[PDB]
Amino acid sequence: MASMERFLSVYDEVQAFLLDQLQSKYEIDPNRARYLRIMMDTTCLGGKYFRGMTVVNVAEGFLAVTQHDEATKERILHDACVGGWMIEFLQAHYLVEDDIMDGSVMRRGKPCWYRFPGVTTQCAINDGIILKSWTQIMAWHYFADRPFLKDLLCLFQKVDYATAVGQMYDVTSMCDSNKLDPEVAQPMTTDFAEFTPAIYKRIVKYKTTFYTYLLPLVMGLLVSEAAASVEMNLVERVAHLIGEYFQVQDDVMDCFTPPEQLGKVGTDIEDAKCSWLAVTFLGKANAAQVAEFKANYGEKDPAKVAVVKRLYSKANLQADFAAYEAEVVREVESLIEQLKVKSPTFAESVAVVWEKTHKR
Amino acid sequence: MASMERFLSVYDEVQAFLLDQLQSKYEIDPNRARYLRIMMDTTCLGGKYFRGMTVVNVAEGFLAVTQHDEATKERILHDACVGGWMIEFLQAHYLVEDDIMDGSVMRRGKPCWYRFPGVTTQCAINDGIILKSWTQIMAWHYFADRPFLKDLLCLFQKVDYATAVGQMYDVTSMCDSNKLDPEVAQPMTTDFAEFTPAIYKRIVKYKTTFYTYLLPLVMGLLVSEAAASVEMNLVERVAHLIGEYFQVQDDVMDCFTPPEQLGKVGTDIEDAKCSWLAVTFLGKANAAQVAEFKANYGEKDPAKVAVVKRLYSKANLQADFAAYEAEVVREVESLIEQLKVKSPTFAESVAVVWEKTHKR
Numbered sequence: 273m274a275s276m277e278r279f280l281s282v283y284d285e286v287q288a289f290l291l292d293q294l295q296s297k298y299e300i301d302p303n304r305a306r307y308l309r310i311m312m313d314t315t316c317l318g319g320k321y322f323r324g325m326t327v328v329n330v331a332e333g334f335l336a337v338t339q340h341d342e343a344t345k346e347r348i349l350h351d352a353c354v355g356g357w358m359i360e361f362l363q364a365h366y367l368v369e370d371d372i373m374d375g376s377v378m379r380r381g382k383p384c385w386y387r388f389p390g391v392t393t394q395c396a397i398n399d400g401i402i403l404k405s406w407t408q409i410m411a412w413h414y415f416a417d418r419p420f421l422k423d424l425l426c427l428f429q430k431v432d433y434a435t436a437v438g439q440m441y442d443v444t445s446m447c448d449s450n451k452l453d454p455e456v457a458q459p460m461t462t463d464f465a466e467f468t469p470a471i472y473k474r475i476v477k478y479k480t481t482f483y484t485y486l487l488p489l490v491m492g493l494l495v496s497e498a499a500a501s502v503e504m505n506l507v508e509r510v511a512h513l514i515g516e517y518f519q520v521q522d523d524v525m526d527c528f529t530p531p532e533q534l535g536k537v538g539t540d541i542e543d544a545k546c547s548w549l550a551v552t553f554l555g556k557a558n559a560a561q562v563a564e565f566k567a568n569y570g571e572k573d574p575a576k577v578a579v580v581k582r583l584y585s586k587a588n589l590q591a592d593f594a595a596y597e598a599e600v601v602r603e604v605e606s607l608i609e610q611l612k613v614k615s616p617t618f619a620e621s622v623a624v625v626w627e628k629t630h631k632r
Numbered sequence: 633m634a635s636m637e638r639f640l641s642v643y644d645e646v647q648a649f650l651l652d653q654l655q656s657k658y659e660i661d662p663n664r665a666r667y668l669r670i671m672m673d674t675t676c677l678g679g680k681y682f683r684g685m686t687v688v689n690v691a692e693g694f695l696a697v698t699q700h701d702e703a704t705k706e707r708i709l710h711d712a713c714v715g716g717w718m719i720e721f722l723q724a725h726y727l728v729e730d731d732i733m734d735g736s737v738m739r740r741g742k743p744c745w746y747r748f749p750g751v752t753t754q755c756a757i758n759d760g761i762i763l764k765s766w767t768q769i770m771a772w773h774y775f776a777d778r779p780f781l782k783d784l785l786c787l788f789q790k791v792d793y794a795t796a797v798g799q800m801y802d803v804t805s806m807c808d809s810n811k812l813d814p815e816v817a818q819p820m821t822t823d824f825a826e827f828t829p830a831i832y833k834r835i836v837k838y839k840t841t842f843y844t845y846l847l848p849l850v851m852g853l854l855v856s857e858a859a860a861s862v863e864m865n866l867v868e869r870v871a872h873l874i875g876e877y878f879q880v881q882d883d884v885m886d887c888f889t890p891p892e893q894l895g896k897v898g899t900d901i902e903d904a905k906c907s908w909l910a911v912t913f914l915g916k917a918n919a920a921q922v923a924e925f926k927a928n929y930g931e932k933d934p935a936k937v938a939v940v941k942r943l944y945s946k947a948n949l950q951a952d953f954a955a956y957e958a959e960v961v962r963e964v965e966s967l968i969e970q971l972k973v974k975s976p977t978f979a980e981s982v983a984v985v986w987e988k989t990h991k992r
């Protein structure tokens with residue numbers, strides 16, 4: 273069985289399980305079951321399934337070098353699929369709630385879920401809640417007697433929290449920290465002093481890397497019973513590095529990838545985000561370029577957004593991206609080599625994760 | 633130590649723990665720590681702490697009849713407090729997100745959290761996410777080696793899901809079920825056929841009773857190591873009964889308690905909610921009263937809201953409330969007696985829970 277086909281089949285299985293359980297235990301009626309089915313499908317399907325598949329791919333690496341009964345190999349791959357769907361559903365929660373928080377219009381070439389006519393924000397906040405609850409229902413049902421359940425739930429819990437923290441860092445990244453105050457509306461930064469590489473790294477580390485790289489890699493180890501084969505400090509370091517690179521790419525694409533390819537009109541400039549482009553621009557600009565940036569950043573007006581996009585082009589940030597890319601290739605290859613000391617198989621999974629990120 | 637004083641002290645302890653951990657592990661800065669402190673305080677404190685205190689009160693019942701070392705009694709009461717705060721923080725999550733979903737203005741005589749000038753919906757959705765994440769961080773840290781941790785996490789997980797499901801039932805309770813469709817905007821019911829006692833019971837059971845009564849009672853048993861002393865089907869039945877009664881009271885107060893005492897302008901009539909008053913009115917009204925109800929329910933216009941409030945007064949729903957109250961007293965006393973068979977101590981805790989609900 274090709275891994276994707278298996279992964280997708282298990283989607284249907286898990287869907288049927290959750291909807292059947294809503295009918296047999298939660299007194300749900302068929303129309304609300306259908307609404308939840310459509311919500312699940314709309315919010316969980318249609319991406320690349322990179323996160324979930326990584327769990328599968330890591331478990332597959334281990335199966336290739338381990339002795340198991342056929343039924344045990346099937347159980348491990350099933351677990352990896354269910355674990356991969358937990359992560360996909362966790363992502364789905366975040367995208368639903370983030371699109372509402374940000375007033376986003378499109379996601380993957382279709383309207384954000386809250387914008388569907390029969391959903392609205394009033395339902396969609398709650399639908400996002402249900403998405404994350406489903407992660408836990410999946411785990412407790414499929415993994416009830418599993419030796420890794422404790423460790424998986426504790427990991428998942430910490431990743432989810434880190435992610436929420438990172439969302440706070442992200443949506444506040446254009447405020448001056450000294451002024452943040454629930455009681456007082458926030459004038460956006462005028463100095464941009466907090467647009468630094470270290471601060472940027474903090475935002476990305478928490479908002480993206482834990483759920484996108486750390487969780488799938490570690491979940492793949494846990495469902496394999498393989499965590500003690502690896503140095504967890506190395507997994508953390510490589511996860512944070514690769515996940516940073518992934519987010520820098522995303523930031524560049526926000527600004528420069530045409531909307532049909534992105535699936536979205538990018539609005540990071542209008543949203544004053546602490547993006548890689550803004551931080552890097554500010555790391556090389558002269559006084560006049562800085563002053564023009566400050567006059568135009570963070571504003572819906574398209575003439576102002578264009579001035580920022582021009583500032584970026586003429587700053588030749590492509591060069592900085594290529595230098596950043598070269599440094600990450602060094603560090604990621606170094607980490608892959610260190611991982612080979614205790615697990616060559618896992619190191620290869622990490623190499624695959626890196627290629628799929630690097631090329632896309 | 634009076635139980636409240638202990639409960640409140642443990643709030644400070646847990647707060648310090650979560651904020652210190654954000655600084656030592658999550659790279660948080662002091663201004664964002666302060667923002668999270670104020671969010672926690674605003675959203676978690678100021679109510680009656682009925683839910684959390686019930687956990688304490690049930691654990692206290694058991695301590696009174698059990699032999700324990702002093703240090704064990706302190707550990708059980710500390711656990712009960714932390715467990716009680718999990719529930720308080722879970723409630724806080726729901727109120728934050730519900731107030732946003734419903735576009736509510738006030739909560740406990742103060743602006744809803746999303747309405748604070750330095751919060752906004754964009755932050756508040758996420759703050760509500762963090763609230764629920766904190767429940768899990770508390771459990772894993774305080775209960776890491778506890779024999780009940782599995783059972784507590786699984787229970788909490790199921791209650792939270794039931795609650796989310798119940799929120800879906802509540803916000804869709806004015807739609808015709810046959811028309812619910814994510815793709816199509818929802819004309820509210822014209823027939824009110826789904827305003828029935830059974831349907832009403834389904835909404836309240838899921839939206840309120842599991843988190844308000846079932847979870848605190850069962851948590852109190854789990855932290856006491858006392859769950860096998862009791863018939864869980866009876867706990868469920870009494871929880872659902874008392875929690876129904878609590879919600880009927882709430883519904884009556886929405887409509888008839890002046891706003892300064894409620895802490896809120898009630899909007900259930902404008903919001904077309906399936907409330908006890910609407911269902912009960914429809915259970916006794918004549919044709920002309922029904923037709924006048926349908927012409928005015930579910931509309932902001934204050935002349936229309938007054939017509940509905942008059943319809944309710946002149947229908948003498950006070951009589952139906954008194955009859956409903958009498959029946960619940962029978963059933964709750966019956967259940968309390970059945971609970972005495974295996975645990976007289978627990979039955980008394982349930983009697984206390986009932987009195988605090990019945991009188992308030």
Ligand SMILES: NC(=O)CN1C[C@H](O)[C@H]2C[C@@H]1Cc1c2[nH]c2ccccc12
Nearest residue numbers: 443444446447458459460542543544570
């Ligand atoms: N009328 C506007 O659209 C202004 N707009 C709002 C964007 O949300 C965004 C960027 C900007 C200012 C701002 C942003 N984010 C913040 C957080 C704190 C303090 C200021 C901001």
Ligand SMILES: NC(=O)CN1C[C@H](O)[C@H]2C[C@@H]1Cc1c2[nH]c2ccccc12
Nearest residue numbers: 803804806807818819820902903904930
């Ligand atoms: N302009 C208004 O305020 C109309 N108002 C909106 C209230 O939210 C509410 C009651 C009503 C109709 C409605 C309600 N809820 C629903 C769910 C599905 C379908 C119709 C409704």
Ligand SMILES: [Zn+2]
Nearest residue numbers: 370373374442
């Ligand atoms: Zn966002």
Ligand SMILES: [Zn+2]
Nearest residue numbers: 522523526540
């Ligand atoms: Zn982006």
Ligand SMILES: [Zn+2]
Nearest residue numbers: 730733734802
């Ligand atoms: Zn509500």
Ligand SMILES: [Zn+2]
Nearest residue numbers: 882883886900
């Ligand atoms: Zn109410």
